[model samples]
Target: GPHMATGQDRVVALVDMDCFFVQVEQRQNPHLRNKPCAVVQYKSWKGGGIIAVSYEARAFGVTRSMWADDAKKLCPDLLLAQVRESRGKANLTKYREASVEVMEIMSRFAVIERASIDEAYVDLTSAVQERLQKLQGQPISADLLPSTYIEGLPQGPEETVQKEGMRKQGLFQWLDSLQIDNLTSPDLQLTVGAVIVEEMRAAIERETGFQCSAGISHNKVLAKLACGLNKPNRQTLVSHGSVPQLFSQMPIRKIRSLGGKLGASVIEILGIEYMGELTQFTESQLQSHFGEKNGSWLYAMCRGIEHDPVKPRQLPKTIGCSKNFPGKTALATREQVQWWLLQLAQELEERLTKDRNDNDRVATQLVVSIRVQGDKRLSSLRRCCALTRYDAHKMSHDAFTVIKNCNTSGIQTEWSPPLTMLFLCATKFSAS
Candidate 1:
């Protein structure tokens, strides 16, 4: 019996764009290439907080959220790009469209799972099987996997060679040693999966001029994990036997869902230091502390046993726009409130129009939400209205009507509590 579970074996991959927002800007403005650059939002507040820092900037101690002035002080020539603003808020439509460009190429290969704006998980099991069948027992072409890294494989002296061919030779020997007449082996299956990921990545860069990193393994968790080990135009392939060694020193917080309070609880309460340490505790023992479902999940996850499937999705379920007014910026008069509401309404309508044209759908509901100043106990009030059409003026008018009705606290012109946030959202989309 081996530590690696082998039932219902699947091939999964996680593809993540490198410093995505910055890359999107660089793609448009090529002069920003190879320089220390960052993308900032709102350049007014202390030079604005940096949101995306380029890798060149990272070497100079520049980081996300560091003030732009501070970033410049760290690197004298650090270039900063401002996020595109529309109405009164930062617009991310450019990055969203760029992401769609990458996903379009990926969709041709496998069932894609849109994890975030810059990341996606694709299930490549069927693709791997199709390629395998076409091979008809022939050895896999070594040239197909020019950039794959197999975890736990020895590099030997060739590691210092620095030449691509040298590294490829090392990888081929390892794959050759593990070869079998049957095609069902995990190592063989994963090696083939690596070829698929390599081709897809090459196609992405060739077609869209955007490079990304990836990880390939038997399931989503391992694939996502492997994707991060090497990045920015590299892909790592995880083998079944490598799980134990890999988790041996992996910080529990590095796993996907365990990065938050749950991970802290595991470390503080259980006195566990690494993911491998959790293997010592029995399943029921963990269940007693964390309830049944979560406890068993932790137990299974520590052993690299993940069954989650890559859910196919091309777009987000909900689309909305919002603006925040902190401190003295809070809206106090009806004019200011209506003006900002119209701004949000216009942005939402534009997004909805694009959604209708691209996805062939229209939002059926409009939601108006507001945040009141000061009262920490007061939860956000969200009001819903049925949407008859995608009209900015109608949205703004309906939102104003909702806000006017909600202000039961006195004068028609002034807000009693002062509004700190305003949002307009479209939901419940249906085919046009």
Candidate 2:
């Protein structure tokens, strides 16, 4: 049967681990399996909330970012995973380790983009083809003559006839007749996909003792959405035929990259509650509001079309570190501000060191973003003078200088004083 064409033949997949943090903890300890578990970043009552929750606890309505007390109330059986502290601060090493394990396994199948500690995008087109060909049955050939033809004909004439006959027959029979040694047959593409997922699952389970869910599809959005369809150690594949029907009923906000404030504005402007309705708006119309590239992209998304390639997995163009403080605090003194800057610099430096070891070259663009308390407004934005060398101490001092010189009064509110959260980002990276 001929398959319906929605658009191009681009195939992409997005794989996300379910309750990643919790799974990591459980994978480390067998007793935690099949039990409700929650990973909290800080041990204090109000220090850090639940960062991840197991599906068992989720069944009781517990969720990520929910208050720890609230989660306990909803699921009394919930087991808490202890988070270690470094230099009197919450440690993220466990989370980092689990993320690396999954990414390393995924890299075997496709180029990977490690979006965060838990999320990844894979370009499986090449891997899929290689896997499929290995599984395809061999063509039939005639190497299996009953040993009678060789004896019946002249040597030259017999050789010609045998070659011609073998060519006429398929290759599979020839392979069968050779019967040399034990050679394993390859499985089909679908089977290979299953094997790939199983291998990943085993890796995650062995390294982190965690189980994950995955979605396989022709593009990123669909693959990500499919991953959510089935949860807790299962995988789902979205076929080409399923695209339209799937998006037709999908809400516009549910689509990734479309979920924030911009998504709301889109819904209000178009009076379009669902993605299916987006077809009514022309690409130019969407571009008018979203700008040229993004507008066209959104329009295509609404029609269940995508052209974005799965970037080969590499170190990010930008490496950043940010932390959310418990309450508003003022850096009334230079010492306090410098201390915070030093901390951020140390984090960035550590990341850069890792990148360097991985053969990634650093760039000079440094951006410092400060988010003041109260309404969570951002202030004190500054770009460094030039691409700076990758030095932690120097970067820290320079970042402090940039912040000290900026005016912070513009976005200050009643609850704002000093700064609540500091962000440090470096960009323009190349990998060998």
Candidate 3:
């Protein structure tokens, strides 16, 4: 059998923290070490929901987004770290600071991109090549310890496997056995990734007191998947040669961009169970179902062909924050609605301020979401408003005015009252 090979060589790395918020809190407060901690907003009853749970807590069935009350039921010993409030709402400043610290550290490796508040991608092709060149004339240590796979074995009895021939070992075991001391050894290519990831992890810990997991691969999608292979201060490397076989067995939904509603369509229409199945479709056939551009992209992605460049600190398009009230209340008077509106505006302002400070930009648009309870259904309304400058007070006032205008008829007696969920968003941003 003959195979078509594309001679493109690019290296990408995705670095993400393990339980980012909890790590941030732990880093800031040394006393939190060795505790089953979770980070949540200050308002324990209304807005207090776990945003990040430590691995120790996770082992006890604790997870992110779980209500504090429910989490307490599962892990009675769970320790809650309250996120400090800003602008009349609980703030995530510490977590966001940790993210910024990580991004700054990663930028030293190569051109880096901040994927979110918790993840980043780095271009490491040139760095890898440079390190490999430096290690061309190093001696192999004859006295080095032979690698062993000790996991799943009885406490002290584990088997040692020699790597001289074609013996196979799990990826994690192989990586764990590699010696990290010889950074410039001739086998640099075999361990360069681990070294880089280790350095990155060290830098993050030093700067932010956080532990991170990283993936080293030839492109963004693969690197992202590899990052999840190890966790809580571990790294995984995916060689360029393993792309085809790995993707063949990988589900199409596992691909980053294809995971949402589009993934369901791929499963339903083509019965495409894996990435291998997607390879069968031509660009034209895929374009017929998807758009022309999207279909072409899918074909390229399936073949492990990626052209996306690493963009560092790309500004996000939107910024917003929301809060959940403890109890549902109908605004009987205009004063009550005004107070809630002011609160929402203050929240939006804080988030906008955070975003502006992080990315050095200002938002030009504001959005508000209001929900009202119904007999068996919930009714929601959304309004969009634009702004010329970034003024927190003015933005809040305008948002309140917009919401008031939308509810022109005022509260109807027969209509169900407002619900507990109130959301505010700002978008259409520009650098100013």
C-alpha lDDT score of every prediction, in listed order: 0.85, 0.64, 0.67
* Per-residue C-alpha lDDT of model 1 across residues 220-324, encoded as one tens digit per residue: 988999999876688888877788999999999999988999899889989988999999999998998888988988888888888888998868778988888
lDDT of 3: 0.67
**What's the candidate order when arranged by decreasing TM-score?**
1, 3, 2
Candidate 1 Cα outliers beyond 4 Å, as residue runs? 1-8, 155-170, 374-379, 400-409
- Which prediction has the highest lDDT against the true structure? 1
TM agreement with the true structure for every prediction: 0.91, 0.77, 0.78
Which window of 10 residues has the lowest lDDT sum in candidate 3?
145-154
Candidate 3 lDDT by residue in tens digits, 96-190: 66676777777776778878899888887678667666655443232221221111211122334543221224434444554545553322343
lDDT of 2 by residue, 1-432 (tens): 377435435445566787787777777787887898888877565535887878788889988778777788888888888677653345676777668777887786667777677878776666756655654544322332211111111212133346445332322332333322222222123223434555566666676555667766667877677677656566655554455666687888888888898889888887888888888888899999778987988887776677777777544577776665545345544566667777878878887777777664766678887755554456445465444576777888887677665444443332225566677888766543
Q: For model 1, what is the C-alpha lDDT against the true structure?
A: 0.85
Model 1 lowest lDDT segment of ten: 154-163
Between candidates 1 and 2, the one scoring higher on TM-score is: 1
